[model samples]
Target: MKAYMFPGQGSQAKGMGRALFDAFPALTARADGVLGYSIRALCQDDPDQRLSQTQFTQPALYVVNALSYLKRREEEAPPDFLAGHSLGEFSALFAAGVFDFETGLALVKKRGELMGDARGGGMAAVIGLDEERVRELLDQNGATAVDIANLNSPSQVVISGAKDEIARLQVPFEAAGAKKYTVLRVSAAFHSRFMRPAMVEFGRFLEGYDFAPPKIPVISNVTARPCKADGIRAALSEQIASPVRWCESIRYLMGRGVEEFVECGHGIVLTGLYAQIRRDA
Candidate 1:
């Protein structure tokens, strides 16, 4: 079976879809209309800077992934499993037939706005560090509030919290054997307690948005498992502040006999992540 995946925020570039857009003007044009800017410019011109903005990042990634999926579907059979990382989840749900494209677009726009509003706290990537040591460092150094926002790999984890807390923890994290640490350029610490307000409002919006049962099974970040009605609803509510268990999702899909995977979006970060998981597994 095949699993189709979508990547989240960090994979964007200014002119990512230029080749596709030039070859398929109609699809790209429609997305440009929805996004209200020339995505081609964002992807093609300054991907480095553009991918750093949450608002532009979400919409651009969504449109590119959705369009890629559309084009791919025209040529191949529909996928058997669907999943996405962070913002990519919206595109995955759309691909699974749970929501229409317009609804997906609108929700993602709001998601970007809410996340942008919540940006500005702090986020840091702790590389080549043990999880227990990092946790101990956070606890002992009075950075207890900072939580693990991502477990990208056994040696890679991200800690998110107030800016001051992160700054203070840098020395201790290094002392505890973190090969390197760097603050992300994002405004706010997402997938942490910092996004509670957005999470609340996002929950309300999700409750009202019409949903169709998915044609194929889709996984949720909350549990890294198949999404049932109640499970999907709960995952949507908690996902804002919850770490995305992408590794688990990929594992589950692979265990279920999904041998081939396709990444449908602007960046192949999902592919990269999966490759890592594959190597480890």
Candidate 2:
């Protein structure tokens, strides 16, 4: 069995999607219309360093991942399973025929705007620590306000919470034999309870849109399983405030007999994380 994975934020770079845009100009033009800027230039030039901004990063990665999928489909057949990390889930959904490119882009546009506009919190990356030990340290360090935002692998986790509390994580985590701890630059505590406000607004915004059932099975970050047709909207909204069950999601695919993993985006972040998941198992 085969699985195709789409990467999320931090995989983006200045020279991404260079060929896919030219190969799919019609869709590229549509994305340009939706975004009100040259998608090509943003990916290529990094103008004002806007690509790193969540509002742009979400839609940009969606477009690039979608185009990359399309270009790949020109030669290879679709994989048996599809999944994406964080923002890349939209790309996976799009690939699965859950929504067309334009509709998916619109949803991601709102998602990015809301996520980027969010405030009052922050996130920190923790390396060389498993979730259990991280939680133990959190309890020991009185980091009750913090929550695991993502379990990227056995050794890498990102925490989200109140800004003051987030600032206090590095020393304790490092002191506990953590290889590294660095606060993320994002202003909002994504994928934690602090994003409840974003979830409420996103749920409301999702009411404006509709989606179809997946043509190909698409694993969700929330449940680490395939999403039901009826659950897509609520799942997308709740995903804002839910820990990304990435390792579990990958394990599910592997348990289902997936042998080959293909990455469908600018970088190998997800694939590398997949490797870690396999290594740990």
lDDT (CA) for every model shown? 0.81, 0.92
Per-residue C-alpha lDDT of model 2 across residues 131-221, encoded as one tens digit per residue: 9999999899998889999998999999999888888878888889889888888959999998999999999999988889999999999
Which pairs clash in the backbone of model 1? Answer: 14-42, 14-43, 14-44, 14-47, 15-43, 15-44, 119-187, 119-188, 120-187, 120-188
Candidate 1 Cα misplacement greater than 4 A, ranges: 22-27, 46-51
The residue-by-residue lDDT of candidate 1 on 1-281, one tens digit each, is: 99999888878866676667776687667767777777777777854475668977888788778878888888899899999888888888888888877778878887887787775578998887867777878878888678788866566778888989988888988888888899887868888898888899888887877667888888887788988855565577689798877778888898999999889877677787788788877
Residue 215 deviation, candidate 1, in Å? Answer: 1.2
Q: Which number leads on lDDT?
A: 2
Worst 10 residues of 2 by lDDT: 163-172
The clash count of every prediction, one per candidate, is: 10, 0
